[PDB]
């Protein structure tokens, strides 16, 4: 229940990503509407943003890495900050040359976001349910992309600036909320720079009982091997020269790149405007809409099952549901395009995919890039996974985008290739956690 307050903080937080990332959605839309309309200025102005915007996503996400180690709750709150200066700033609209550094910054934010968020909940709630506030986690951040998409609905370009302004106002309420009320920092870190009373406080609230031995032992534990790291001086570059180490860091990167290697978002977008098929743009924006109500009530059940079935079986159905999805798309759009059949079938196989991946891939693969990693090495491996999201997030959002351009096969059959390959993957080299202690990996025992 308070771990729930917590977790509903971050999921402030979330909110906030799950915003940025609709209203990127829609600026990309829009400048794609105007560069068909035309023709030097539009192109310049939005690649730079975008660029600068992504970028700025990378850079923050490995210099989250850095600053999450001084803090995570300190972190959360520089996040909040970042995104209430840069919002005001990019709603101000006043200022022409500013706008970059602001689309910049916001980036920088959405990066510390990515990163922060995980570890945070992670950390400050059950060793059991932890997966389950990370589908909370997961559950805010496209519910903020859905009331983003629904707030959507020379005057209505100042309505643009208040949907600019309202991240000010939430931002508001998270470093009112989180301050007020929440001034501790998480367990594990407490013990971490030594300090063991504060720990065992802020355990006893979380755990809501006056015995936090076994919990506070597993911590200890985690401390005791972070010293020991310290002692044979143990660091990431160290770690790609042990042969364990980096099967686990390659695991974890490979398996978030194999996340954005679905193509989600993008064949969102791509497809709602790829076939139309002569149907009101109505009918359009009805169809996207539904697609992220669809996600969030798709979302729910990811805690679920989180909570019942466990890790990497969900995953396995998941992939299931995307290659049921994906192989007949790809076989009838080969066959001819501009078929009502292959439209239909397209829509349909996009609901069930998106479905599936929300409800499988998503909570799932956030919270055992958290959990996999062991206390040795874990704030590092975790936050270059996340660099490798990006990396794979943009290698998926503009190459799909030309070749969605070039002709909509290609997509379909390498992104089947791609979710074969990750059902393969996951049933092969993945471990389940469920039940996991904290700092501790089913690959490697003891040292
Ligand atoms: C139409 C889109 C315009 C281009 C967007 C460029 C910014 C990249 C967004 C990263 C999306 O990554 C999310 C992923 O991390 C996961 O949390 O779930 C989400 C879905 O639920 C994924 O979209």
């Known amino acids: 229940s308070t771990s729930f307050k917590y977790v509903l903080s971050a999921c402030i937080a979330s909110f906030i990503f799950g915003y940025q990332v609709s209203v990127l959605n829609t600026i990309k839309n829009f400048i794609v509407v105007e560069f068909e309309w035309c023709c030097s200025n539009n192109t310049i102005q939005s690649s730079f943003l975008l660029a600068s915007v992504f970028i700025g996503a990378v850079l923050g996400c490995g210099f989250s890495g850095y600053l999450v180690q001084f803090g995570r709750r300190l972190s959360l709150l520089i996040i909040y900050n ?11 609209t006043h200022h022409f040359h500013t706008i970059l550094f602001a689309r910049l910054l916001s980036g920088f934010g959405i990066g510390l976001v990515t990163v922060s968020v995980p570890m945070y909940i992670s950390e400050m709630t059950h060793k059991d349910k932890k997966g389950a506030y990370g589908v909370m986690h997961q559950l805010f951040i496209t519910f903020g992309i859905f009331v983003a998409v629904m707030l959507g609905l020379s005057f209505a370009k100042l309505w643009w600036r208040l949907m600019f302004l309202f991240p000010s106002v939430i931002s508001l309420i998270g470093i009112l909320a989180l301050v007020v009320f ?37 911590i200890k534990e985690a401390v005791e091997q972070n010293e020991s790291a310290k002692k044979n001086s143990l660091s990431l570059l160290s770690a790609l020269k042990i042969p364990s180490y980096r099967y686990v860091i390659i695991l974890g990167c490979l398996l978030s790149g194999l996340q954005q290697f679905t193509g989600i978002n993008v064949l969102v977008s791509n497809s709602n405007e790829l076939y139309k098929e002569f149907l009101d743009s109505h009918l359009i924006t009805i169809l996207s809409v539904v697609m992220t109500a669809v996600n969030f009530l798709m979302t729910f059940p990811a805690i679920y099952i989180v909570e019942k079935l466990g890790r990497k079986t969900l995953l396995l159905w998941g992939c299931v549901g995307v290659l049921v999805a994906y192989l007949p798309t790809a076989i009838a759009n080969e066959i001819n395009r501009n078929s009502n059949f292959v439209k239909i079938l397209s829509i349909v196989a996009t609901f069930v995919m998106i479905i599936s991946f929300a409800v499988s891939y998503g909570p799932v693969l956030w919270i055992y890039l ?8 874990k704030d590092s491996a975790a936050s270059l996974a996340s660099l490798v999201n990006w990396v794979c997030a943009i290698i998926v959002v503009f190459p799909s985008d030309i070749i969605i351009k070039k002709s909509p096969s290609i997509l379909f059959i390498v992104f089947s290739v791609m979710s074969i390959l990750t059902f393969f993957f996951i049933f092969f080299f993945i471990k389940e956690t469920k039940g996991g202690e904290i700092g501790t990996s089913p690959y490697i025992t003891m040292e």
């Open 82 to 92: 970042f995104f209430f200066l840069v919002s005001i700033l990019t709603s101000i």
């Open 182 to 218: 929440f001034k501790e920092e998480t367990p594990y870190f407490l013990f971490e720079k030594g300090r063991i009373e504060e720990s065992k406080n802020i355990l006893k609230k979380i755990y809501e009982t006056d015995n936090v031995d076994e919990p506070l032992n597993a």
């Open 370 to 377: 958290h959990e996999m990693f062991p206390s040795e090495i």
